[PDB]
Structures are given as C-alpha cells and as structure tokens.
C-alpha cells in the first residue's frame, strides 16, 4: 500500500525565485528526495546550491 506521488517544476531565469518556489513547494508536498538534471544551462555557474542548502 505504499504510493509514489510525483511533483515536477520547470526552469526560471533567476536563482532566488526558483530557490524559494522549489523549497516551499517541495516542503508543502513533504517530499523525500530532490533531483537536478539540466546540463544545457545558459548560465555557466551550474548552481544547484540554493536547492542543496535549503533541503
């Protein structure tokens, strides 16, 4: 009787709004794991850091 509920979000050009939105949404959904899987970032920084620190 275990169930797997899925939640996905897309990109936004900013890194604070994306951070806060993802944090609040995946906190409210009470998720267990978070993934980052985008190579072709126009930003050369390659920063998933806000997601990592917030989670």
């Amino acid at each position: 009787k275990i169930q797997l509920n899925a939640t996905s979000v897309t990109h936004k050009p900013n890194a604070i709004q994306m951070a806060l939105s993802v944090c609040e949404d995946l906190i409210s959904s009470q998720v267990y794991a978070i993934l980052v899987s985008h190579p072709p970032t126009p930003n050369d920084h390659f920063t998933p850091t806000p997601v990592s620190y917030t989670a």
């Binding site: 806060l20 609040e24 906190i27 806000p50 917030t54």
Partner: protein
C-alpha cells in the same frame, strides 16, 4: 540613512535593546542609520528567507543582524548562503549565530563575534603553561575544524 535590520528569535529584552540602540556617538559622521527590530521564531530556514526577503524589499536593508538562543550551527551555515547571494552583509552576535563554521564564501559578507580555533588553542596552552602540567593527549572527531586545531597545537 542606511537601513539596518535587527532580528530576534527567542526570549530577550527587546525593550532594553531598543532603548540602548541609540547609545552610540555617530554624530561626527553623516550616517543617520535606520534600524528596524523584528521578532521571529525558529520554525524553519524558509521562514527566515521569507522574512529577510520582505525586510530587504520593504526597508531596503543593507545589513542584517541575527541573534538567537539555539545550539545549532546550521543557522550561520545557511546564513552564509544568503550573505554570499545578497550584496547586503550579515552579522551574527549571539546564540546560534555565533559558532564559527569551517569557512565563509569568497563572495560572503558574514562575520561573527568570537575567537578562532587557533586562538583557543593558544589560550588552552597558556593555561597548561600557568599550572605546570606538560603531559597531555588529544582526541577529536570528524568535525571539519579538527585538522586546523591539530596542526595549530
């Protein structure tokens, strides 16, 4: 007319601090800083993010001071990210915002009130010099600041 943010979480004499807020002699330089004091809780980091977002959006905060009463190093650990990602510097003076983590970011602007590991090692060796005890041993766990202490001693 700089904007200074004061955030207090936990029990504290807010009225005494507010009365003693204007206890400095800053009349010799045209600064007239603006200080806003706000109380907060220790619910979650995202609440702190929302509070600082609102404060900097409203009052144009150019400086954040955090004081708390917890015993968790995560406060400054996450505050480092905000300090690095925001041009406004942040300061920690008491509570959970006082313990020094490993290191700050290159773009970080967050500072703390306290001594370094090496200064504490020097004081502890001064104590061992004061009372003649010259035989000792050192044991530690895998907290990041262990190599610094061992090499300093």
């Amino acid at each position: 007319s700089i904007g200074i943010a004061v955030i207090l979480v936990g029990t504290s004499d807010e009225v005494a601090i507010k009365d003693a807020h204007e206890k400095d002699d800053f009349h010799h330089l045209s600064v007239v800083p603006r200080v806003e004091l706000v109380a907060m809780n220790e619910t979650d980091p995202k609440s702190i993010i929302t509070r600082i977002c609102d404060l900097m959006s409203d009052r144009k905060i150019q400086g954040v001071v955090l004081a708390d009463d917890t015993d968790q190093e995560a406060i400054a650990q996450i505050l480092d990210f905000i300090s690095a990602q925001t041009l406004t510097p942040i300061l920690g003076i008491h509570g959970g915002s006082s313990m020094i983590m490993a290191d700050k970011d290159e773009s970080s602007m967050f500072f703390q009130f306290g001594p370094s590991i090496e200064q504490q090692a020097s004081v502890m060796l001064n104590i061992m010099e004061e009372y003649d005890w010259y035989i000792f041993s050192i044991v530690t766990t895998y907290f990041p600041g262990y190599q610094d202490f061992v090499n300093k001693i």
